[PDB]
Structure formats: structure tokens, C-alpha cells
């Protein structure tokens, strides 16, 4: 699924244009998928600060 | 007191329209504001709520803080909050919980004196040793001391 | 110090915390831009020759391979937490309803007029 | 009436049924479970009359009627006369029938299994109702009272079943039933007014005792004392307004016959009390449970509405007890009541929405489902 | 979480599991060696329970429960319940998940196999560890002791290791495996109590038995004339408050439980005791090693931590030793937690980072790996 995540370049067989196109694109890929990674970060942090959260009104409630 | 018009923010409003639309019954005949006390047992008994001559008459004592049997829209949606806590809509529990971890900065889980000291002081509102233990005994509910997180929530719930 | 003080001074208290989490999605926002431009490092796609290119789109096949790798990572990261929330949460939910919960209910209401 | 398929809840002593609908706190009537009959033969034509009375009706005619009790020590022994007075209970007076309502019943752990069978059948076949459970009393006083743990005296009409509880299990090993109850105490206490010169042999007159006690009596927590004083002065006396304009004047007997609570040996039965009783259903657990059982004395049922229980109670235990421990004891005004609450918050509680007997496992298995499905 | 990917240790013996992360001076905090069960059937609904409990869940919640220990004599043979104690461990009182950090457990070498491969794939496989390293408790206790020469004695729960160790090099020959351990003399005093009249048979009399043995008992140094005024006089007897409120006096066998570690027919073991195993220990090195032994008999794990022990150990050994030499026991305050804190600083060493099992190695030769790579 990460094979699939990631897109198989045209690398050798095309001219400049098409070939800095499919650069680009992936590279745009990566841009966008470090903005989600970031945004999945921050929730990430979000949700163990409510995790510890939990435990702690666990002790409260236990 | 404050909750006067902390309600009438509280409050939404579609509330109040049918608020004002019962509200103009209470006349017996050419009143101005000289709403009575007595009436109260069944004002309350109008505006969608089932009272009990107990409550009516705690009201009667409890609410009437200007004695003069009379009742602002303030004092109106107040004793309407401070009893049913038609509040302003306490926005979650989960995004409160993304406020209580900027509550704790220190990421504890727990609103601290220290922690509602320093977001009161993020409000700018300085800290009274009364505020932030007003505040800490109010959300503080196993009085640790500070505020733990659903201690937060019952306390922040129905709260802007 | 009735119901007014504390609410209106926790009011105001939750106010600063709405103010400071608009404030972290905002630093989500803007550190996420700027991860967006270091981590996603820019293409020197201007002058260059066949090879090179041929490499570098290679290397961004390689990246966007990477780049969803950790993005699964930080996903799945935030899936477990979800697990674990509704397994602490499940436990919070049944011991608070044990405070409350049998007592959540409202009867013997007629009896003042039956 | 209602406008919701809530359960329905009663619970049906050798007393009275207390019933009313799940999610109430409280029963919305109390039906006596009484068929009365008219021992008289009748001379006037146009009057009316039953064939047989109910409830409420056979109280309020009782003047010329016998009145019987279908259960006997919690087992019903005359279904059919069951049958009548839940009729009336659901259709003519809480407006609510079985029929468009799933079912809860209240009973001892150790009922004969019988008895379950029988009345299982009776709201299935006879009432229809859409399902069924019947529950434990001790579970339902906790659920009631707060808690999930202690000792739970139910003090039934015909019968004490006293069961230890802990973390929500039952501990039955340590189950001490005692076949003492409030009908028993009327017992003495009419043995003892008869001394005085106010013989209660029939009907009406055993009603009246029955109410005297409910009204005058009380356990006081040191007996010995109490009588040193009521057995030497008046001032301790009082007097009970009979139906006819008479009264009876009563002592002692005032709190002779509560103490059978803790004396048994009053009315022929071989046993230390209720208090000895309860001690042995804690005494008789873990060591590491007995000190959650000692906070927990929990007192339901009937007859705990005598002055004094919570005290005589709670000291007793304590000179059994070992020392250094905290003997507790729960007496809250759900008393008597808090077996049917208890029904009402089992039979709403969204935990026990699976453990409701349909019927359509009813008829697949027969009534003996309920020994597999309830308990 | 941690402010370096620094290993977690977690010491789990046969009594309890002692953990925290690796460059600390203490565990976080210490579990039972315990997965409890329920020996009980549910009355009220609604009420939680776990299928299991563990540690000190297992513990707080006993009274209801039958408690396991999933190690024998340093073994462990259920594998399922310390996945469980772990899980607990980690993630609730450690607050770090082993995936981000390497994890180092201990075991004596005399353990037959089962026991490092499953810790070691229990922790690769369950918890995908990225490292593994399985310790000699020996070497753990040396470190945490401040030597490099001498004769560990680790007397413990499970089973007396007795292993010496000469400038860091195991001396194999002279290991002697013996079955004597704490959880012999927790039984033998059950049954002495039981003669007393205060019979101890169930988990949570044993439970309470091992907190009466580490509170109440000592060895002494003279355990003869000890018992001839203790199992003569009152005034050597010592109160202990049993859970319910009731007590227990302890006189002889107070001392008479810890003795049969120098007295094992007490519990018809057909041994030396303690103190002769670990003079055979010394005898069976080289002569040119012997001195350093005797000079360094080093006390680790539990039991050592009775009074008169160290005494008690130092003179019997004296008396086996020969004359001129200087017989001596270290007994440093890391005594019962000195295999975890050996754990943390063998974790930590920079000659120790080249012995941990990645989670590469793992998967190409399986948990048979644990025999090449870590002793």
C-alpha cells in the first residue's frame, strides 16, 4: 500500500518537459503529504495530552 | 451579580423569542412592572419547565434579590441559567479538551493554580488568590488543588 | 461569589483557552507550511541536463515514498491514540456513570397533585 | 397513561405488591396481596357485589369479608388469586398491563426455584408479556441504596434472606436465610395484646394488629433498658384508635415485638437475630472482603422502618465485630420502597437491556428458561 | 517521552516485577508477579470487571479473586499474563511504549531456556521493542553492589542462585541451583501459624502470611538460644493486624520461618542451607580464587534483608571457613532491588551497547537468537 502510496515515475523515457513535470508533481506529493503529516503530528500531540487527560481522571474516578 | 448578563450572552435566542412571546401574558389588566411574587410559582410553571411550590418559593427568596418582587430580562435568563443551565452551549468536551491542553501548558492534564493562574493572566485578568481558587474549587471538584480535565469539563461546560 | 463570579471568571478563562488552541492550529498551520517547504525540499528544475532530472524525479518517487511512509507513521500514531482514548475514555464513561448514572433520572414528580 | 413501552415493575411479597412502571423511584400504588371473600350470606338484591374482591377493595369491605394471602414465606401458593389482584394492579389501577410492557420481578436467591417457574409462566401465557427477568432483592436495595457492595437485609413479609455482596458478585456461601419476617413480628405482638385483654383472632382484627404495629412499634437500640422503664410507667403508653371508637392501650409490647427481630426465640424459632445473623454473612467471607462488608450493612425491605434499627443494628454488629474495624450501616428512606426502585433502575439500566428474557426464548424453552436466564 | 531512547529494564521475578527506565537509581514502580482471577459469579449487572486483574489490580481487588504467579522459581511458564503485567507496567506507571525504546529483562543462567527465549519474544513480538538484551542476575547484583569479585546471593522468591564471579568472569562449575527460596519459607509459616490456631490455606491468607513474613520475621545471628526464651515467653511475641481486624502474635516462629534457609528440612528439602551452598561455592574455585571469595560474599535480591542475617551468614561461613582468613558480607540498601538497579547501569554502559539483539536480528534468526547474543 506504501508502493502504491508513493507513484511510479516515467523517469527514463521522456523528454524535459514531461519529465520535469513528473518531478514536480511527486515533489508538489511530498509538499502536500508533509502539510498532513504536520496536521497528523498536532493532532497526534492533541490526542496524548487527552490521553494522559484520561488517565488522569481515571485516578480520579478510580 | 454578573450572571445577569453572563445569561443574556449565555443564552441562545431562539430561547428568548418564545421567552418574550410568553412573557407577554403576565399582564392581569394594565401593569408597568408590577409583577408579584405570589405569581411566581405559576410564571415558572408557564415558560415549559414542571416547578414545585418548594423551588417557587425558594425563588421567591432566591431570585427577588431587589426585593421589589420585580425580575430584569438579566435577572430573567439568569435564574433561568442558574438553574437550568440554558448556558452558552459549553462548547464541547473535546474542544475543551484542546483548550485544557493550552489550560496546561505544562501538559498536565490538571489546571492548576499555576496553570489558571497563568492563563487568567493570558486573559490579562490579574490573579486574585479568591479567582483562581474560585476558579480552582469551582472546576477543582476532588479539591486537589488544581483542576483535573472533566473537572474542567462540569467546570467549563455551559460556559463560553 | 454565586454562580456569577466563578462562571464568568472561568468564562473568561475559557475564552483565553479558545484564543490559545485558535492559536495552536494556527502554529499547526504555519509550522505545517514551513514543514511543507523543509521537509518537501524544493526541485532545482531550472538549466539542468537529462540524467539529472532523470535522478531527481528518482528521488521524488523516492520522497513521495517516504513522505507517505511517515505520514502512515504519524496516521497509525493517531489511530492508537484513538484506541487508547476509547479504552480510557470507556473506563472514565463507566465509572463517572456509576457516580451518576443510576442517579440520572427524574420520577415521583405527580405527587403534589395525585 | 404512558406513552413508552418502559418496563414494568413489581414486587410481590406475602404484604403488599409495590408496582409501578421502570423509571419511576417509586411504585405508582401498593396493591395488598389480599383476595377477600364474604363469609356471609346475602339477603338484599340490587347491591352490587363481587364474587370476589381485590386489593384495595377487599381492604375497604373488609367488614364482612375473610381475607387470604396467596404467598406464603415469598412462594405463591394460590396463583390464581395472583392472577386477580395483577389484573387489577395493571389494568384498572397503574394503567399499565405486561401485555404492551416487558416484566421485572423481585426475589430471594434462594426462593424455591419453583416459585419462578410459575410466575414466569403466569406473565407469559396470561398476561403476555413481550419478555421477562426476574432479579435478585439484595442487587436491586445496592442499586438502590448506592452500592455495590454489603450485606443486604430485605426483611420480606414471610421471610429474611440476608446475602453478602461484593463487587457486584454474590457470595453465597455466606448466605444466613432466617425464616423470621414482619408477619412474624405481628404474630407476637397480637400473642402479646391478647395477655393484655384485646384478643386478634379474625380478620378485621388481625388487619388492625397488623397496622398497630406499623404504627407504634419501634426495636429502641437497648432493649433492657427500654423495658426497665415501659414495664414501670405509663408515660411510655400509647393508645391506638380501633375502627370502632375504642382503643387499645399498649407498653412494652410496643417494642416486645420488634425485638423478635433480635430475639427470635419470642416466636419458637432457634436463632440469635438478625444482627448475629448478619455478622455471620460477613464473618463468613474472605478476610479481605469482610472489611468492605462491615462498611456495608445494608438494611432494605420492610420492618427497618422501626425506630432505632440503624442503632441497635449498627452496635450489635459492633460487639461482634472485631475491634479496630468500622461497622457502617445504611438506612435510607428508600426503605421498604427500595426493592421495587432498585427494579425500576435493573429494569431501565442500559447494562441489563440484554438480559431480558423474549418471548420467543419464553416459548422455545417453557417457563424453566428463567433458571437458565435469570439466576 | 524520555530526553534520550534509553533502555527500559524491568526486573520480574517469581514474587515481584521491578521496573523503570534504564539510568535511573530506582524502579518507577513494583508489581506483584500476580494476574488475579474472579472465583466468583456476578449478581449485579453493569458493574465493570476484568476477566483478569494484574499486579497491583491483582492485588487490590484479591479479595474476590484466586492469585496466580505466572513465574516459577524464576520460570516463566505462562506467558500470556506476563504480556499482561507488562502491558500494565509500561504503559500505566512507566508511561513509555517499549516500541520506541530498547528493553533489557533478567534471568539467572540456570533457567532452563523457555525463560529468556519467550521474555525475549514476548518483548520483540507483543510489543515490537526495537532491542532486546537478557541479563545475569549476578552480574546485575555485582554492578549495583560495587564489585567485579564475589559470591552473589540473591535469595529471593523463586529460587538462591549463589553464583560467583571473579574480575567480571562466571565461574560455572561453581554455580549450585538451590531450591530454597522465599516462597518456601511464606508456606512454612502458614502451616506453623496454623498449629498456633490461626490456620492460613487460601490466596489471600497467603498473601497475607508473606506481609506478616516480611514485616514480623528475622533470621538471628543465635537461633538457638533465640527460640529457648522465645518459645518460652510472651514478651518475645509480636502483634500483627490481620485485614479484618483480628490478630495474630508471632513468639519462635517469628525467627523459626526465615531459619530453614539454614534449616531446609523444615520444609523437607534435602539441602546444606544458605550458608553451606555458598561456602561450596567459594571451595569449588580455584584456591587463588577462594580468598576473594570469602572476603566477598555479597548479599543481593530478598530475604537478606532479615535481621541477623548478614551476621548470621558472615559466622556460619566463618565457622566452615578456614583460620587466619577474614570472612565478610556486603549487604548494601539496594538489597531486593539490586537486580533492577544493576539493570539500569548495565544498560547504560558504553561497553554494553554492542550486546543488545536489534529488531533485525531478531526476525532473521528468531528467539533461538537469545543463546548467541546475550550470554
Same mark, same amino acid.
Given at each position: 500500500?506504501?508502493?502504491?502510496?508513493?507513484?511510479?515515475?516515467?523517469?527514463?523515457?521522456?523528454?524535459?518537459?514531461? =519529465?520535469? @513535470? /513528473?518531478? &514536480?508533481?511527486?515533489?508538489?506529493? %511530498?509538499?502536500? !503529504?508533509?502539510?498532513?503529516?504536520? $496536521? =497528523?503530528? @498536532? /493532532?497526534? &500531540?492533541?490526542?496524548?495530552?487527552? %490521553?494522559?487527560? !484520561?488517565?488522569?481522571?481515571?485516578? $480520579?474516578?478510580? | 451579580?454578573?450572571?445577569?448578563?453572563?445569561?443574556?450572552?449565555?443564552?441562545?435566542?431562539?430561547?428568548?423569542?418564545?421567552?418574550?412571546?410568553?412573557?407577554?401574558?403576565?399582564?392581569?389588566?394594565?401593569?408597568?412592572?408590577?409583577?408579584?411574587?405570589?405569581?411566581?410559582?405559576?410564571?415558572?410553571?408557564?415558560?415549559?419547565?414542571?416547578?414545585?411550590?418548594?423551588?417557587?418559593?425558594?425563588?421567591?427568596?432566591?431570585?427577588?434579590?431587589?426585593?421589589?418582587?420585580?425580575?430584569?430580562?438579566?435577572?430573567?435568563?439568569?435564574?433561568?441559567?442558574?438553574?437550568?443551565?440554558?448556558?452558552?452551549?459549553?462548547?464541547?468536551?473535546?474542544?475543551?479538551?484542546?483548550?485544557?491542553?493550552?489550560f496546561?501548558?505544562?501538559?498536565?492534564?490538571?489546571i492548576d493554580l499555576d496553570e489558571l493562574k497563568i492563563m487568567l493572566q493570558a486573559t490579562?485578568e490579574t490573579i486574585t488568590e479568591?479567582d483562581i481558587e474560585?476558579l480552582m474549587?469551582?472546576?477543582?471538584?476532588?479539591?486537589?488543588?488544581?483542576?483535573?480535565?472533566?473537572?474542567?469539563?462540569?467546570?467549563?461546560?455551559?460556559?463560553? | 461569589?454565586?454562580?456569577?463570579?466563578?462562571?464568568?471568571?472561568?468564562?473568561?478563562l475559557?475564552?483565553?483557552?479558545?484564543?490559545?488552541?485558535?492559536?495552536?492550529?494556527?502554529?499547526?498551520?504555519?509550522?505545517?507550511?514551513?514543514?511543507?517547504?523543509?521537509?518537501?525540499?524544493?526541485?532545482?528544475?531550472?538549466?539542468?541536463?537529462?540524467?539529472?532530472?532523470?535522478?531527481?524525479?528518482?528521488?521524488?518517487?523516492?520522497?513521495?515514498?517516504?513522505?507517505?511512509?511517515?505520514?502512515?507513521?504519524?496516521?497509525?500514531?493517531?489511530?492508537?491514540?484513538?484506541?487508547?482514548?476509547?479504552?480510557?475514555?470507556?473506563?472514565?464513561?463507566?465509572?463517572?456513570?456509576?457516580?451518576?448514572?443510576?442517579?440520572?433520572?427524574?420520577?415521583?414528580?405527580?405527587?403534589?397533585?395525585? | 397513561?404512558?406513552?413508552?413501552?418502559?418496563?414494568?415493575?413489581?414486587?410481590?411479597?406475602?404484604?403488599?405488591?409495590?408496582?409501578?412502571?421502570?423509571?419511576?423511584?417509586?411504585?405508582?400504588?401498593?396493591?395488598?396481596?389480599?383476595?377477600?371473600?364474604?363469609?356471609?350470606?346475602?339477603?338484599?338484591?340490587?347491591?352490587?357485589?363481587?364474587?370476589?374482591?381485590?386489593?384495595?377493595?377487599?381492604?375497604?369491605?373488609?367488614?364482612?369479608?375473610?381475607?387470604?394471602?396467596?404467598?406464603?414465606?415469598?412462594?405463591?401458593?394460590?396463583?390464581?388469586?395472583?392472577?386477580?389482584?395483577?389484573?387489577?394492579?395493571?389494568?384498572?389501577?397503574?394503567?399499565?398491563?405486561?401485555?404492551?410492557?416487558?416484566?421485572?420481578?423481585?426475589?430471594?436467591?434462594?426462593?424455591?426455584?419453583?416459585?419462578?417457574?410459575?410466575?414466569?409462566?403466569?406473565?407469559?401465557?396470561?398476561?403476555?408479556?413481550?419478555?421477562?427477568?426476574?432479579?435478585?432483592?439484595?442487587?436491586?436495595?445496592?442499586?438502590?441504596?448506592?452500592?455495590?457492595?454489603?450485606?443486604?437485609?430485605?426483611?420480606?413479609?414471610?421471610?429474611?434472606?440476608?446475602?453478602?455482596?461484593?463487587?457486584?458478585?454474590?457470595?453465597?456461601?455466606?448466605?444466613?436465610?432466617?425464616?423470621?419476617?414482619?408477619?412474624?413480628?405481628?404474630?407476637?405482638?397480637?400473642?402479646?395484646?391478647?395477655?393484655?385483654?384485646?384478643?386478634?383472632?379474625?380478620?378485621?382484627?388481625?388487619?388492625?394488629?397488623?397496622?398497630?404495629?406499623?404504627?407504634?412499634?419501634?426495636?429502641?437500640?437497648?432493649?433492657?433498658?427500654?423495658?426497665?422503664?415501659?414495664?414501670?410507667?405509663?408515660?411510655?403508653?400509647?393508645?391506638?384508635?380501633?375502627?370502632?371508637?375504642?382503643?387499645?392501650?399498649?407498653?412494652?409490647?410496643?417494642?416486645?415485638?420488634?425485638?423478635?427481630?433480635?430475639?427470635?426465640?419470642?416466636?419458637?424459632?432457634?436463632?440469635?437475630?438478625?444482627?448475629?445473623?448478619?455478622?455471620?454473612?460477613?464473618?463468613?467471607?474472605?478476610?479481605?472482603?469482610?472489611?468492605?462488608?462491615?462498611?456495608?450493612?445494608?438494611?432494605?425491605?420492610?420492618?427497618?422502618?422501626?425506630?432505632?434499627?440503624?442503632?441497635?443494628?449498627?452496635?450489635?454488629?459492633?460487639?461482634?465485630?472485631?475491634?479496630?474495624?468500622?461497622?457502617?450501616?445504611?438506612?435510607?428512606?428508600?426503605?421498604?420502597?427500595?426493592?421495587?426502585?432498585?427494579?425500576?433502575?435493573?429494569?431501565?439500566?442500559?447494562?441489563?437491556?440484554?438480559?431480558?428474557?423474549?418471548?420467543?426464548?419464553?416459548?422455545?424453552?417453557?417457563?424453566?428458561?428463567?433458571?437458565?436466564?435469570?439466576?
Amino acid at each position: 500500500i506504501l508502493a502504491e502510496r508513493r507513484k511510479v515515475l516515467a523517469i527514463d523515457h521522456l523528454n524535459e518537459d514531461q =519529465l520535469r @513535470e /513528473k518531478a &514536480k508533481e511527486l515533489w508538489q506529493s %511530498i509538499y502536500n !503529504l508533509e502539510a498532513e503529516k504536520f $496536521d =497528523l503530528q @498536532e /493532532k497526534f &500531540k492533541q490526542q496524548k495530552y487527552e %490521553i494522559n487527560v !484520561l488517565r488522569n481522571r481515571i485516578n $480520579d474516578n478510580q | 451579580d454578573d450572571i445577569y448578563k453572563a445569561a443574556v450572552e449565555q443564552l441562545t435566542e431562539e430561547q428568548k423569542n418564545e421567552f418574550k412571546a410568553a412573557f407577554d401574558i403576565f399582564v392581569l389588566g394594565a401593569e408597568d412592572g408590577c409583577i408579584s411574587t405570589k405569581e411566581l410559582g405559576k410564571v415558572m410553571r408557564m415558560l415549559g419547565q414542571n416547578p414545585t411550590p418548594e423551588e417557587l418559593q425558594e425563588m421567591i427568596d432566591e431570585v427577588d434579590e431587589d426585593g421589589s418582587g420585580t425580575v430584569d430580562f438579566d435577572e430573567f435568563l439568569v435564574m433561568m441559567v442558574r438553574c437550568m443551565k440554558d448556558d452558552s452551549k459549553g462548547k464541547s468536551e473535546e474542544e475543551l479538551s484542546d483548550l485544557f491542553r493550552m489550560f496546561d501548558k505544562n501538559a498536565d492534564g490538571y489546571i492548576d493554580l499555576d496553570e489558571l493562574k497563568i492563563m487568567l493572566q493570558a486573559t490579562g485578568e490579574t490573579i486574585t488568590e479568591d479567582d483562581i481558587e474560585e476558579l480552582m474549587k469551582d472546576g477543582d471538584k476532588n479539591n486537589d488543588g488544581r483542576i483535573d480535565y472533566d473537572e474542567f469539563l462540569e467546570f467549563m461546560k455551559g460556559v463560553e | 461569589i454565586s454562580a456569577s463570579r466563578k462562571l464568568q471568571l472561568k468564562t473568561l478563562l475559557l475564552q483565553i483557552a479558545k484564543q490559545e488552541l485558535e492559536r495552536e492550529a494556527e502554529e499547526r498551520r504555519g509550522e505545517k507550511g514551513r514543514a511543507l517547504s523543509t521537509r518537501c525540499q524544493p526541485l532545482e528544475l531550472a538549466g539542468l541536463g537529462f540524467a539529472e532530472l532523470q535522478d531527481l524525479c528518482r528521488q521524488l518517487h523516492a520522497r513521495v515514498d517516504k513522505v507517505d511512509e511517515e505520514r502512515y507513521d504519524i496516521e497509525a500514531k493517531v489511530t492508537k491514540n484513538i484506541t487508547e482514548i476509547a479504552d480510557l475514555t470507556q473506563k472514565i464513561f463507566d465509572l463517572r456513570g456509576k457516580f451518576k448514572r443510576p442517579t440520572l433520572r427524574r420520577v415521583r414528580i405527580s405527587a403534589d397533585a395525585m | 397513561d404512558e406513552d413508552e413501552t418502559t418496563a414494568l415493575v413489581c414486587d410481590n411479597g406475602s404484604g403488599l405488591v409495590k408496582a409501578g412502571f421502570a423509571g419511576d423511584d417509586a411504585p405508582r400504588a401498593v396493591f395488598p396481596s389480599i383476595v377477600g371473600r364474604p363469609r356471609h350470606q346475602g339477603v338484599m338484591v340490587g347491591m352490587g357485589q363481587k364474587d370476589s374482591y381485590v386489593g384495595d377493595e377487599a381492604q375497604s369491605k373488609r367488614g364482612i369479608l375473610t381475607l387470604k394471602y396467596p404467598i406464603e414465606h415469598g412462594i405463591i401458593t394460590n396463583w390464581d388469586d395472583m392472577e386477580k389482584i395483577w389484573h387489577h394492579t395493571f389494568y384498572n389501577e397503574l394503567r399499565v398491563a405486561p401485555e404492551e410492557h416487558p416484566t421485572l420481578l423481585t426475589e430471594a436467591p434462594l426462593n424455591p426455584k419453583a416459585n419462578r417457574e410459575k410466575m414466569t409462566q403466569i406473565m407469559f401465557e396470561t398476561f403476555n408479556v413481550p419478555a421477562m427477568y426476574v432479579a435478585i432483592q439484595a442487587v436491586l436495595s445496592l442499586y438502590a441504596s448506592g452500592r455495590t457492595t454489603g450485606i443486604v437485609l430485605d426483611s420480606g413479609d414471610g421471610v429474611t434472606h440476608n446475602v453478602p455482596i461484593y463487587e457486584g458478585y454474590a457470595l453465597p456461601h455466606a448466605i444466613m436465610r432466617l425464616d423470621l419476617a414482619g408477619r412474624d413480628l405481628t404474630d407476637y405482638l397480637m400473642k402479646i395484646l391478647t395477655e393484655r385483654g384485646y384478643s386478634f383472632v379474625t380478620t378485621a382484627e388481625r388487619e388492625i394488629v397488623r397496622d398497630i404495629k406499623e404504627k407504634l412499634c419501634y426495636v429502641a437500640l437497648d432493649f433492657e433498658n427500654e423495658m426497665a422503664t415501659a414495664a414501670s410507667s405509663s408515660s411510655l403508653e400509647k393508645s391506638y384508635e380501633l375502627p370502632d371508637g375504642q382503643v387499645i392501650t399498649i407498653g412494652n409490647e410496643r417494642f416486645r415485638c420488634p425485638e423478635t427481630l433480635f430475639q427470635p426465640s419470642f416466636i419458637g424459632m432457634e436463632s440469635a437475630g438478625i444482627h448475629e445473623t448478619t455478622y455471620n454473612s460477613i464473618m463468613k467471607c474472605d478476610i479481605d472482603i469482610r472489611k468492605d462488608l462491615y462498611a456495608n450493612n445494608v438494611m432494605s425491605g420492610g420492618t427497618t422502618m422501626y425506630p432505632g434499627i440503624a442503632d441497635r443494628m449498627q452496635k450489635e454488629i459492633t460487639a461482634l465485630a472485631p475491634s479496630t474495624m468500622k461497622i457502617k450501616i445504611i438506612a435510607p428512606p428508600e426503605r421498604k420502597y427500595s426493592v421495587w426502585i432498585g427494579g425500576s433502575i435493573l429494569a431501565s439500566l442500559s447494562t441489563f437491556q440484554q438480559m431480558w428474557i423474549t418471548k420467543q426464548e419464553y416459548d422455545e424453552a417453557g417457563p424453566s428458561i428463567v433458571h437458565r436466564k435469570c439466576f
